[PDB]
Design a protein around this ligand. Structure first.
Ligand SMILES: O=C(NC[C@H]1CN(c2ccc(N3CCOCC3)c(F)c2)C(=O)O1)C(Cl)Cl
Length: 77
RNA sequence: ACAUAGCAUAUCAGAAGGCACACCCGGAGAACUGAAACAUCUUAGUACCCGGAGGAAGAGAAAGAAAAUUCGAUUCCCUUA
RNA sequence: UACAAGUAGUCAGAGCCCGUUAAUGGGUGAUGGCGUGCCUUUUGUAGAAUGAACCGGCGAGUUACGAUUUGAUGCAAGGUUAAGCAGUAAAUGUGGAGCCGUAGCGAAAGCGAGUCUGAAUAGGGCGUUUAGUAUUUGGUCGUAGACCCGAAACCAGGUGAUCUACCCUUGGUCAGGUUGAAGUUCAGGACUGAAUGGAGGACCGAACCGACUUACGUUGAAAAGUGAGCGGAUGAACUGAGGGUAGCGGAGAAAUUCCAAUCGAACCUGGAGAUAGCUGGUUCUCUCCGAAAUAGCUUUAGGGCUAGCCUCAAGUGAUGAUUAUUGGAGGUAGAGCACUGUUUGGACUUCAGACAAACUCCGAAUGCCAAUUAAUUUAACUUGGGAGUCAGAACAUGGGUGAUAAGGUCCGUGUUCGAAAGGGAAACAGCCCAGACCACCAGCUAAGGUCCCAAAAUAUAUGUUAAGUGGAAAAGGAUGUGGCGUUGUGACACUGCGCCGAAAAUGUACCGGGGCUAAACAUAUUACCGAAGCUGUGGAUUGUCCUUUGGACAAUGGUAGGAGAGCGUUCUAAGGGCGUUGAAGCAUGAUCGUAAGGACAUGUGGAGCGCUUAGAAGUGAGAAUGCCGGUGUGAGUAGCGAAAGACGGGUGAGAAUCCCGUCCACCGAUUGACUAAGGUUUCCAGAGGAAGGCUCGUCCGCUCUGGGUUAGU
RNA sequence: UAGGCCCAAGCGACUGUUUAUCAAAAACACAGGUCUCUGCUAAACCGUAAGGUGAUGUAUAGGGGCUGACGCCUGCCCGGUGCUGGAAGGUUAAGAGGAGUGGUUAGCUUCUGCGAAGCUACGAAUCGAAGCCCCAGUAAACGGCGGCCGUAACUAUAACGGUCCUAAGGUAGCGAAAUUCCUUGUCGGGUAAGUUCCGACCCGCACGAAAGGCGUAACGAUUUGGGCACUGUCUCAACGAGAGACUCGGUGAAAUCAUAGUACCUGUGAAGAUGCAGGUUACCCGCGACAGGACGGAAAGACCCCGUGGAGCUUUACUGUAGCCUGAUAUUGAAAUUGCUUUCUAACCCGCACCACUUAUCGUGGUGGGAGACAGUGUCAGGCGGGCAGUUUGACUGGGGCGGUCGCCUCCUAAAAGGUAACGGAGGCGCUCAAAGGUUCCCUCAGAAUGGUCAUUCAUAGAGUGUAAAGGCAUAAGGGAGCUUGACUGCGAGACCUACAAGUCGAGCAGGGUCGAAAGACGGACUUAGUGAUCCGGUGGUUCCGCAUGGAAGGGCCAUCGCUCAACGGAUAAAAGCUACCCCGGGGAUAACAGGCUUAUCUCCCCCAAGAGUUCACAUCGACGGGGAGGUUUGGCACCUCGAUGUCGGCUCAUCGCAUCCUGGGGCUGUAGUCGGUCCCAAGGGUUGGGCUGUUCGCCCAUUAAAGCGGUACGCGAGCUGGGUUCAGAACGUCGUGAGACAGUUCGGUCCCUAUCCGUCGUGGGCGUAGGAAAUUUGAGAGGAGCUGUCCUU
RNA sequence: GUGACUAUAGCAAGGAGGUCACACCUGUUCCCAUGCCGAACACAGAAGUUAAGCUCCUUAGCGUCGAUGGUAGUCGAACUUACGUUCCGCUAGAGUAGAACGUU
């Protein structure tokens, strides 16, 4: 009567890692993701795996890109 | 054949057995155990057992130790650790 | 104290009797309220889970050496000795070999306040902290049995065949009867018949040896028997004596059967205190704090290790929390069909309508992350020493699974129990209220209630219900009844409360009981009762602020566990004391302390003990189916071991039982006579009656005191 | 005092033997049969050896394996595997051999290179037996003996055919059997009644020829069925005798025991209360008796599970071993002929003869004979070797076994941050690319409508993206083309994740470059799977070390390689099973019974009413659907009990519910009467005796007014039995290589207790009831009884 | 021309605009190019033409934004098995914006 289910993956902690309006140091991770759910703004860059990191230590502010898309910019403190 | 096995007399405080469930030196020599199982390994060359001593026993007089400008049998104690 | 329902106490309390360490006295206790022992183990025990009959004594984290951290002390870029020698088994002197430290980095060569990687201080890792060290107090860990008790087992060296298995050597026993093979002998004619013969793991059947059935016994007469029957009973029989085979072995007509009441591998001593991730137990008091039942890995799943949650010390120092505000990320509930599927009815792609955990054109409530924002509060982190936890439960709620079963099972969030007493739910860990420092015969409230049991309203205003509905349950039925609205005295939609549907087993038995027509319901007013909550008073310990070192405020449930302060016992040193005009101890007492406990007085006792301050421990017992001793209960109970005794006469302190006599009874292939093994004086006579004899005893196989065994065969 | 007999059947031929103490048998032995080894220092066995037994025997003898008198027989196959035999080959050890490399250094003389002899670290080709591969044989060696269809001179059936497979397809006999699940097979016999028995048939799940087949006179403390006789076994009990019991005198235990002033009921509770709640009942003390409760007492559950617990047994589990065979070599000599061969004598050997020690089957010596460099013995090597030994034989798990799974990736569950479980719902991975990477430029899809791959309009977007799924992408991350190797070297501020080890991202910096005119981009692929600690071994470099010194051997560092170590944090280089012969430590953390919750299943009741019932839905019946009750069955959960809660069915005794079988009272009928059907009230009483089966249920027989259904631990084992059920023996079929297991089936098999409390049944005493008595009573309350037939009359 | 901007910008319909700017338009002579095609790409250029593009103005047919009010849904609380209070407040749908704001 045995079944052929019962196996999942490992959950990979995947989501926003800094809050809008927080002071970040210049290499912190800002958002992890599969494919661009949010885009790299100004002073921010995406690497392989598309994770968003801040190049320079400033403030992080989530913004809008058109009607649908979004973006993560890092102003200067 | 010579002879040598035997055989029979004689001498000998020769030997024998015990004993301290202590010590020591050889012969032979487990297992439970630890390895969180188990076999190499460990317990352990331990327990028991057998033989020989002796008041001690064994070791002992460099075919050694070392690497300085050397020491000079063995045993044992502290360290090296 | 003989009308009463009892974890045997506790609070209140008359009545009766006494009279102390003399102080809100002691003993008893009609009666009323409350109240289901203690440990252990558990999610959870009154538990019908464990364990303890009771009393007394004994009985469980210790020591040696190392490491680590903490307190104290001594010195300080230094600290310090080890063996040895001297010394009273002592300090102590001496003994600088050795160790730690002031310098680190690298695998290393080797550099050095730097170094390694590197082509490159480029960057980066590790250093430049600039005080260590020695001894000792405590915590903890390591190696030794290492908190105590407890295996089944394994190995080595011996002791066992007097039982039982098999064999060997030499002996013995089997009442009686029945049948009638071969063989032979005769008469015949190879074979027949009659005599004879006495064969047989033959037949019947005692001893003998077994053990089929069945009853009895099962704290037995007996650790395998007795009664009645039953089988072999000249043989593969039974049996005595002397011998032999021995445990990694031996014997087996073979059953895992026997090897000294024990055998899938004997018994004894040693390794040995084997090991036990398992059960059980683990001894004095108080004060403060106070969990977990989770993640990960695991030859792992009732174990362990790191992390999460607790505790103590030091430090940093606002970094903690709830709220307000703003910003944000994210796709749930909801909803919708634009995507992917599913789908109804038409029209002929399209109108209208539906479904979705793995659909989304959309999209909350909450929760989450922030600011360096404000407001109330006072935690938070780090580095250290120490742990415990890894079996969780119910309740509400969001889901999976199951069957929109389960006091089911698995996860998110919360609460309580765990570890939490008090009030309500009748009783009832988890439900509602509420967190016990202690005393009080004071007050206010909380859930919940106010007819009586049972504290407080037979309150108040307005209505509903007649079923005892209240005070267990549906589909469906139906001129029950009230409200309200729409309708042509009839008909309707919504509704309030009721009826039927409605059957279970010891006893009413689905309000806790009486009882209730209001003491049930719906809405609103008051009053009051009601807890260990809060308040008032007094008290006790911790704290922090100094109004005035005074007060003032705050805290004080607790299991695993962490920390502190103490009591008591034996001994030791020093000091100072008591004591034959009475020590220790024991008995009684109405005494002082917050507890462990400390005094005092009187009896008993007869010769040693306190007290202060330190030191050292075989330092505290209610639990181990703990060990040893005593003593209960069961209880005047079961039993008193196969069977015929009676009377007379004695002896006697005492006679169912001892002696003598008469009668009677039982055995008689034996209950008689004799001997081997074995026992080893039990044999006889005089005396005895403490213990033994399953009762008694004047008796004896018992006790005391003297005697008894004679060999050339 | 002293045989019951007869008719049949299964097993075993017979007498015998067996589990001391739960099994006496169908088990063992057996006389007989057959296979096999053994030439005598026999084989086999004991002991390390000497030495023995075998046997003071010798192939008509000795050991071992199977079967089991007697009679008739004993069929077939040699794949595989065991055994005997053969030696062509293939393969294989020590030992022989020593081409040949490396180390060192005299010397060379370059300057890291050459290299004598030695000493030394390793070696190659060749020679090296037995074994294994290979070739045959063997079946009273181990074992094993098929399917699927069609078809008349046998109605349906299949003598006969077609096909595939192999070692070979089960012969003679027997057959629902100690073997048959279905199944109490079908038939006949026996009985009034036959799950047993007998006789047959044959769909032989799953008979069958020496683990023998079939049959058999005699024998059996064997198993089974049936008669005659006989009976207290029984209907259905009665009385008498003795012992215990009871009362008296004497003596006088024991297990047990937290303290007890110890009631019932309905509840509640760790879900089965003397002790809690609420009610109901009970004056204080005994004595005799019974056995419902104290989850009564003994025995730290023999069942079940768990110990990384033991023990015994098995095997083609792992690693070993006593032994046995085979080679080189030492003891170990000569001759011939070519290391294989053959001859000789002195080594060695003689359980050979004689002689002497010696008025000894020991031994020693001497002499002959035989054997002879072999044997035996020592060291070394190979092989066989459950004969024996030490051990391993996973976990999760709605108990365990069987089934499945175990590591990584993507979804949903997942409750809009992240994380989040189940043996919840779906899938994938253990790679692939030298261009499917980088860069630079250009380009835009899928499908329809149109016409006959092509052309155009329409076409956010439905394609493609290597590969799952999700998230993204028309900045293109999709397509095409040029150029190249960044699929770089040393690193890395900071961050996410995180128990640890790991994992992921990363600006920027230096060395070197590729593309581009340049800014710039580039440390693989649109993102996320495609992987495995350490230890050890190998290889390439190197700066390090190299035990007096110089080299080297060997190490270290850097770079790579070797793990379905897939049980994927990997226990070792190396590992399966049974126990019903079992053993210890634990658990109600976890099963079997009973209890508890649930009600899927079960029993019953109802709603709607399409219909059937001559028309008529509702006398009776009730499709498709719907809603309940109960707590008897089959289950689910796993809450109490594993320091013990004893099973099914009968016997004794009952008691309760009502969902009524009979008797009592009614309604409606498709009720003429008798007789019925279906509802309704009713629990007072009653509710049979046999056959078969362990049986309950179930069928049958003969009656009756009727032959009720349920609860009470499927009531009751301190009241009884012990037939079945799961103890140890033995056997059948089947499975297993095996030890052994059941789907099974069959024959045999120790049932302990002296009653303390409550409870019940009897029977006394103390006090009470306002003086002490005797007698007669009322009766609150409680208990008993309560059934029915058939005849005649109307 | 070139940036910002959440389609309120778009899709659509009409109608109007010529070389002074924007194209279409003329050809391969080279620069460069088509897996064929001076189609595109790009080079030399004036003619002929707004027809088309483009831009400017008008239309609310689709597209998009979208209030209010109520409802669903819940945070929390209190009786209890799903109603009652208080706050937050949707989707859908009707009223509406709307034929683009805007730098250098
Ligand atoms: O001691 C013993 N049991 C102690 C406990 C357990 N139990 C008990 C009762 C009945 C059974 N059944 C019924 C059906 O399943 C098999 C047999 C059972 F398995 C155990 C009981 O009542 O008490 C036995 Cl060994 Cl005598």
């Amino acid at each position: 009567s045995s079944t052929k289910n019962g196996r999942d993956s490992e959950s990979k902690r995947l989501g926003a890692k800094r809050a809008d309006g927080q002071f970040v140091t210049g290499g912190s991770i800002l958002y992890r993701q599969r494919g661009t759910k949010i885009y790299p703004g100004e002073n921010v860059g995406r690497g392989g795996d598309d994770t968003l990191f801040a190049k320079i230590d400033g403030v992080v502010k989530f913004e809008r890109k058109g009607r649908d898309k979004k973006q993560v910019s890092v102003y200067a403190v």
